[PDB]
Each structure stands twice: as C-alpha cells, then as structure tokens.
Nucleic acid binder design. Structure first.
Ligand code: AMP
Ligand code: AMP
Ligand code: LYS
Ligand code: LYS
Ligand code: NA
Lengths: 506, 505
RNA sequence: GCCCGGAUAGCUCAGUCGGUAGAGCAUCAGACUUUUAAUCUGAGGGUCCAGGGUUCAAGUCCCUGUUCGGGCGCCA
C-alpha cells in the first residue's frame, strides 16, 4: 500500500529506532539563521564554492529533486525564507553515508545541514552539505499544493499546516504582535500604567451581554468571567493612579460573525482630568502612527469581499474627519430631526418610525427609541466612512453611561472611530456622580433581572468607590482584532485569531 | 459617626446641586502635573511669591489645617507627590468666594487649584490659589490614621482606600509592571514573537491541575478554561515560528489561600533548536537583569514572614549555583538512594514510602512514586536555596512533557530555578517523539481514570501536530506573581494582586 | 434562534439521465552529477460526510442529523 504513507513511515522510523539509530537528536548546534545566511552569502558569483567556510543551518525540507544517483537537491524553508541544499556525494563525507542519509530524507522532514556555502551554475544560492543530520521526521504526507492551501476548514483546524504551507499567515501574526507592541509603547510613553484586573469577577453586574458562568469548587458558588474591565479601572483611578491601561481578553457568550468572536482582545485605558475632546487627538496620533509604522504608507488597501471583490483605498492622514451625528443625520435624511430635548418622548419615537418606514429601513418588531435610531445611523451615517471618521456626541437614548453635554442638552459625550464601516475605537467621558450612577445601575439591574432579583446585577462595591470621589476622567476602548483585520487586508476575524474555536469533528 | 458624616455630606451635596452650583464639573484643564510642578519649582528659595505665572493643578485633599479665618492650608496628594496649598484671602479672587469655597471643602475631596506658585518662610513649596474648584466631593469619612489602614482584609477588599492611605501599595504595582515590561522587551530583543493563545479549549492541557468548566451558547458544548498554553505554543513551533512567548493568565480550580489565587499570570516561551542547558544562561541573564534593573543592585533583602522577623539576604550574582537533584538528594539522604534510573516499579515506590515514613514525612493517600519523591525533595533538599539555585535532572515520572536525558536514564532534561526556597521558573527539553508522547498521555489518562483527579487527557490534535514533525525545542515557564512577591518584599500573593479573590463572607 | 450553499482516492479537482469513480498532485521501485512545480519509465486507489428512504436500479432524487463557508438576528 504505497498510498498509505503514514504506516510505511512509522514502520521505517520504528526500524530506525530499533536499529541503533536515533531519529530525534536532543540538540543541534545551529550557527546561523537562514535569513542571515541569505543576506550574507548573496554576493557570490554563480558556480562558486566557499570550501573554507563551514556553517550549520536547520529547516524543513519542502522539495526533493533528484538529478541523479549522486546529486539530490533539497529546499530548506524556515524563517519564511528558502535555501537550496545541493547534495553532492563527491563533497560528502563518504558515498555510503551519502546513500544512507539520502534514503531516509523525505519531503517535510526537519534536518540539520552542515556544509559550505556556494552557488550553482544557474546562480541559485545553496549550501553544499558535509553531514546531513535528521532532526525530526515528518510521518504524515505533506501535500505539494501550489498557490498555497486554500481550504478554510483545514487552515483553521490545523494552524501548523497553514503556517507550513502558506507564508502570509506568519506576516499577519507578526503584524498583530507589532500592533500590540506599538500600543504598549505609546501608552507607556504617555505615562500610563499597565494593570491586570481580575478576569473572574464575583457577580454578573448590569451587562445585557451573556456571561460565561463558571463554578468554583472550593467557594461552592458560581463565578462569571470578565465582560469589561471598566469597573476595576475606575476603582483604581479613585485610588490615585490617574492613568491606567490594560490589553486583556474579554469574554462575551454571544454569536460568532465575521467581525465578532466570543473571546477577543481589547485595549482599555482611563485617564483622569480629561474628556473625549482631549481623547480624539490621542486616538488620531495612535492610529496614524500605527499605520505609518506597521506599514510604509498612510494609505492601506482593503478588500471587504475577498481578493476578487471590490478594493477600497483607505487613507490614514492624521486629520481624521469629525462629524456630529445629529447634524449629519439631519442632512442625510434631509429633514429636521426632533430637538434632543424631546427625544425621551413618544412623538419622537413615532416620527422616527415614520422615517424608518419612508426611508426603507428594517427593524425588529421591538422598536424602542434607541434601536431604530441606531438603525438609521447604520444605513445613513457609517455606511459612507471608508476613511477613518470620528462620530461626535450620540443621543442619550443610545447609552446613558456618559456625562451630560456641557452645552447641548440630552446628548451623551462620546465618540466612535469608524474605519471601513466598522468601529474600532470607542471613548466616553466618565460619569462620576454617585447618585446618577446608582440610578443607572438600578435601572440596568431591573432590566437585566429575570424576576425579583436585585444587587446581583449591581456592583455595590463599585458604587461605594464612587462615593469616595472619582475625578473627571475619560475611558477609551479599541478592538485589537478589528484593527488587525484592517491592517492585514483580512475580512474574517478567524484569520487573525491564532487558534480559532472549532467544533469537534467527531 | 461615619453614617452621620455620610448623611450630612450627602445632604450638603444635594443642596449644592439644587442651588445651581454643580459639584461635578465636566472638565478641568490641568496645566502641569504635580510631580513636574514640584521638580520645576523646588529650586526657589523660601519667602518668594511668583505673582506672574498662573498654573492649574488638581489632586485629593489630605489635610485641611486652619490658621484663623484668613489663612487655610490644604494638602494635595498626587502620584506619591505631596504639595501644600496655602489659601490666602488677600491673594484670592474675593473674600466672599474665599468663605464660600472654604465652607464646602472637607478632607478627601478632589479639588482643582489655579494660581501662582510660591513658598512661605518655612521653606515648603506652595501654590497661592486664585480660585479653588470642587471636582468630586468625598461623601464617606476617610479614616485619618498615622499608619494607613493596616487591616489587610479592608486593604484587599477596598484597594482604592489602600492606595489613598498607603503609597507603598502603588509602588508594589509599579515594580510588578516593570517586571512584566522588562521580560517582554528581553524576549522581544532576543527575537521572540508575542502570541495570544486561546483561553478556552475542548480539554485542558499543558500542565497538571484542576480546570474550570464553563458553557458555550453558540457552540453548544462545555469548554474548559486554560491551564497552560504549552500545547498551542508547541503547535506554533511545529508550524514554523521558531521562537514564541506569551505573558497571560492561567486558571486553577483549587482553594484560595495566602499564596494561591484562582487566576494568575505566567510567562512562557518556546525556542527551537535549543535545549534545557541553553536556557540555563538565558534565564540566569534575564533574572539578573530584572533584579539589577528594578532594585538597582544585585542583592535583595527579603522577609519570609513579616517585616520584623528573620531577614535573609539573597544575592543574584550572575554565576548561579548549579547542582543535580537525584545526586544531591542521595548526598543529603542519610541512607543510600536506589539507582532508580531504570527502577520505577513497585519496589521504588515501596522504598520511597518507608523512607518517607521513617523521615516523618506525611504525603497524600495516593503516595505516588512521583508524589512521594517531590514531597521528599521539597522537605529535605529544597530548603537551602536562599540564593538562586538550579535544580536539574529530575526523574522521568515527575514531568511527562520532557525529553529523556541524553546521558542519564529515566531522567527528564529539565531544571528548576529556586530562590528563597520557592520555585519561580522551570524549563524542560520538549519531547518531540510522537510515539513516546502518546504513551505518556495514555499512562496519564489511565492514572486519571484509576485514582487521579487533576491529571491530563489525550489530545489527538497535539499528537497529530507532533506527527507532522516538531524541531528540538526547549520550553520555559515562570510565575510572574512569585517574582513580584520576591522583588517587592511581600509574603502574600494578595499584596501583588490588584483585586485578589477573597472569601465572600 | 431563522434562512442560502457545499462535503468525492492520502489531497486539488472532474463525473451530463438514475444505468459504478475518473484525471492530476502526492506515494512506492527504477534511470539520469547542476535541478528549481525538475524530467522519463512502471505500480497501486473509493462507496461519493452518516443514516434512512424513492426507485428495477442512487454520488446524482428527497428527508433528516454532523461539520464548515455565507446572510439576518444577539452583543441596549
Ligand atoms: N465580539 C467582538 N469581536 C471582536 N471585536 C470586538 C467584539 N466586541 C467588541 N470588539 C471590539 O472592541 C471594541 C471596544 O468594545 P467596547 O469596549 O465594548 O466598547 C469595539 O470597537 C470592537 O473593535
Ligand atoms: N493555585 C495557584 N494559585 C496561584 N498561583 C499559582 C497556583 N499554582 C501555581 N501558581 C503559580 O505558579 C508558579 C509556578 O509557575 P511555573 O513555574 O510556570 O509552573 C508558582 O510560583 C505560583 O506563583
Ligand atoms: N471601557 C469603555 C469606556 C468607558 C466605559 C464607561 N464610560 C470602553 O472601552 O468602551
Ligand atoms: N509551562 C510549563 C513548563 C515550562 C514550559 C515547558 N514546555 C509548565 O509549568 O507546565
Ligand atoms: Na508519474
């Protein structure tokens, strides 16, 4: 059964292990990386042989071309770079050792090559080995798939196979790590302090998002995973540390979409004695420097519908577009929206429903004032911001978790940074009034409470912290994955996730 | 009184809100930070008054000393920086505003001061206020004590109170951040790649512990919480990324005590084409650099229990002590230790049992050959590592994820760094053999079925990844919290944790 | 939670009505001392995701189920 490669390879390796041959050596002394080898010994003329120079390199064989019984060509691939290995028995230790070592090497094997650098007569950089050492054989078949692997299921289930075959995934992960490093550097230079808040809190709190209930055996009580570190950061700000940040993981037991994952990484910082107006400039510097540093140009090309789909050229020039959504929505709808003062009344709800019907906007059967307005915004506002765009104060009906506007009435102070019709940043001015916060929590607990349950959906511990006095601060949150998607021309969150969640094959 | 104080202050704040004035202004543009203010204006000689520059600063009042009715001294508190505000009626906006602003400010309230820097004849830096704005009143009565809340319970349950009354806690967190920041940069400049492995998996893997069980609604199934990212790191190394590292959280479903938490942070890295003796230098250099960069010197004084008991003086001199484990235990053990390199059968468990019983060592009912050996080593050879020390060449049955010793038999190519009689970081040589790994997993699963509870399962995907070929690598792990305790002179894991888990009571 | 799509030899794809399923890559054995998707000569291989049905007859026609790729919902 020649096709049954796994059984044959396993038998061969078992025979090697039995017959006094170790196919898993403990240590191989690598002297130079493949990248440095390519960068250094590139000036050689074709048909050169640096006999005096001897180095050691290691990598995975990706091809085994046999031009004869004494000349076999290998293709080491490591560090995302490739190096040919022209194996000539004349330059080997001995003919018998040459045959013995070439009878075991197959595609996908990991070897340690010790030989002189050189170039072939066709001007291809290679290394003429003096002793090939088998490091870790590959038992399963490695497919010679051109244009790389293109099956989503195998690419996401077997990430190692995707990294071995495809080469751009390594670039994607490298770019994500740089993004994280750049955010850390910027925030640390601004004077912020990195913190590690608990990820397993004690009570659900007032969060419409479904939590991840977890049972603690010793405590004999349920624990809920962290949805957002908002409360702990603000309790730290009360303590005296006026600038904190944390790039951690969030857990939301919700659905999975192209841009939504149950577990995701976000960066959240809180700075005292500031506001969202003071934060748009910081966000501008953040994003502009990120795009300029990770890439080489402020302009980024994005494909929201795959490589064959429509291409969009976003521009990250630092002066991002700022729009107040009330005026922009009025202009788009071409009508005078009710004054923000009446927004809590029923006639504004009625008239907004009239806009939804007239302008052909869909909405679920529940049609509260915040949600249909959010629908109008989705189809008449963000749908046009290919470039980064700041949306200014939003109606208080959206989210009352922000302070009242200084000049405008009934307008929460917030902004959302929209890129490619998707929000990446979101910052608020902070409510530091204990009474208003208590009323908000009470309302959230009443909404979240399934029955006559209270406190469980509130954070009295936090409500006590605000009673001690919190300075006027401003929060800020960015989705790391939602930015890595745009900076890597990725339209799916699973492409930037290292090991995406997959149901068992069974 | 605290209830009366809260009621009175709440009524006063409500009255203030009613009468137009808002005690919670939206914004206050602070011109200069308190530390920068102090550093810039400390050069002044006593007695001057720079009536030319107006600066706006903010902080929390810590004391309100009264000297008559025409002079009130405030005491702002910044990031461990104290500035004294002396409010003078003559230099204020007006007398009426002076009275109206001094009749509403109490201890603990957050205020914003705008005015001219100065210094009285005594010689302390002050800012003469032109107007004082109340930003956030403190309704509760802040405890005024000359020592700072000493009740660890309150210190832990209410960390904001601890930070307000105690500054050392703030620095403890600064050092912790420095430790993590240094480690990331050290691996970064070595060429490592930072990764974010999943926190929820089908089954736990990477270490041996009791996991947390959750439920997923979208994918209807039970998902266990992360115990160690080891397996995913090894799959990544199989993929082609030679060097990886990750500083993230791990979860254990064990009891909560003075030195254990449900959630903790660990640093794990994996580099290919190396071995456990290659990390012997990297780990030593990283620890020595951490100690020198954070403390400022290579010697650290640590109090194992309380700041008044014995104070052992450790020394992080880069040539760390290196000894073997089995051989040193043989030397330490009064009686002869069985060869046990090829001996791991009932006889070895029997001899370890009689040794354990004879040495008055008590071990959990399993008394596993491994559970016996680790207890014996930890009770006899473990307590000599005041200075950092490497303990290498462990027996095979202790760790099921380490390659067999190139020379020694039935011994794992692993070492442990022990400082202050505690484990801070250990590293093995990764076992890339798929058949041997599958056997080890099968024995682990058999033990779990028989009488074990926190042992691991079979991970078929990891076995397939090993079948695809894993280069010779060496992993390395480190508990951040233990090093934070050692470098900040803390005997409790609660001290180095911002909001440590406590019994609900 | 609701709809639209698939699954074929180790793997990348063909397969017309319902009248077995084919080709390349890869694998194995050979020849070739300058190849690079090396070339040439030989050899294997499957019930077509899993079940029921429908039929004289099913990869094809239909139902359910597993698991992926999408859309609307959820994430105030
Ligand atoms: N489920 C999710 N999947 C991916 N990114 C998310 C998810 N939820 C939130 N984000 C990102 O996190 C950012 C801040 O979210 P929030 O802190 O809830 O305002 C958003 O703007 C998104 O970029
Ligand atoms: N139950 C636990 N709670 C908190 N920290 C723990 C617990 N178990 C182990 N640790 C930490 O894990 C460290 C060892 O990590 P490592 O050397 O990577 O195995 C210890 O020094 C502790 O700080
Ligand atoms: N942490 C929030 C911002 C502050 C929340 C309360 N104003 C976020 O990331 O969206
Ligand atoms: N993190 C591992 C040890 C270090 C990494 C070895 N692969 C553990 O403690 O379980
Ligand atoms: Na052929």
């Amino acid at each position: 059964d020649p096709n049954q490669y796994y059984k044959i390879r396993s038998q061969a390796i078992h025979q090697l292990k039995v017959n006094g041959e170790d196919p898993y050596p403990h240590k191989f002394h690598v002297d130079i990386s493949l990248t440095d080898f390519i960068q250094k010994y590139s000036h050689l003329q074709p048909g050169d042989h640096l006999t005096d120079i001897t180095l050691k390199v290691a990598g995975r064989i990706h091809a085994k071309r046999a031009s004869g019984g004494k000349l076999i060509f290998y293709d080491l691939r490591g560090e995302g770079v490739k190096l040919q290995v022209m194996a000539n028995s004349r330059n080997y230790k001995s003919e018998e050792e040459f045959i013995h070592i070439n009878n075991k090497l197959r595609r996908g094997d990991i070897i340690g090559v010790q030989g002189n650098p050189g170039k072939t007569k066709k001007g291809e950089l290679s290394i003429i080995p003096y002793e090939i050492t088998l490091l870790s054989p590959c038992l399963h078949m490695l497919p010679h798939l051109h244009f790389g692997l293109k099956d989503k299921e195998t690419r996401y289930r077997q990430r190692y196979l995707d990294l071995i075959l495809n080469d751009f995934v390594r670039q994607k992960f490298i770019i994500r790590s740089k993004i994280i490093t750049y955010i850390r550097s910027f925030l640390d230079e601004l004077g912020f302090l990195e913190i590690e808040t608990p990820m397993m809190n004690i009570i659900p709190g007032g969060a419409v998002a479904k939590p991840f209930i977890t049972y603690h055996n010793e405590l004999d009580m349920n624990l809920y995973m962290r949805i957002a570190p908002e409360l702990y950061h603000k309790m730290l700000v009360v303590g005296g540390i006026d600038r904190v940040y944390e790039i951690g993981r969030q857990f939301r037991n919700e659905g999975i979409d192209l841009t939504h994952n149950p577990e995701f990484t976000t960066c959240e910082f809180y700075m005292a004695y500031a506001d969202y107006h003071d934060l748009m400039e910081i966000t501008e510097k953040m994003v502009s420097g990120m795009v300029k540093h990770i890439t080489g140009s402020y302009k980024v090309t994005y494909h929201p519908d795959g490589p064959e789909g429509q291409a969009y050229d976003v521009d990250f020039t630092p002066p991002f577009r700022r729009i107040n959504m009330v005026e922009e929505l009025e202009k788009a709808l071409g009508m005078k929206l009710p004054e923000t003062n009446l927004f809590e009344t029923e006639e504004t709800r009625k008239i907004l429903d009239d806009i939804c019907v007239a302008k052909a906007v869909e909405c679920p059967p529940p049609r509260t004032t915040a949600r249909l307005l959010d629908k109008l915004v989705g189809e008449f506002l963000e749908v046009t911001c290919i470039n980064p765009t700041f949306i200014c104060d939003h109606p208080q009906i959206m989210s009352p978790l922000a302070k009242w506007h200084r000049s405008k009435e009934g307008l929460t102070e917030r902004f959302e940074l929209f890129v490619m019709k998707k929000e990446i940043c979101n910052a608020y001015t902070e409510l530091n009034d204990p009474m208003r916060q208590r009323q908000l929590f009470e309302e959230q607990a009443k909404a979240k409470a399934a029955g006559d349950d209270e406190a469980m959906f509130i954070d009295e511990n936090f409500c006590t912290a605000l009673e001690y006095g919190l300075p006027p601060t401003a929060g800020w949150g960015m989705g790391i994955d939602r930015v890595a998607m745009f900076l890597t021309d990725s339209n799916n969150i699973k492409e930037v996730l290292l090991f995406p969640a997959m149901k068992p094959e069974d």
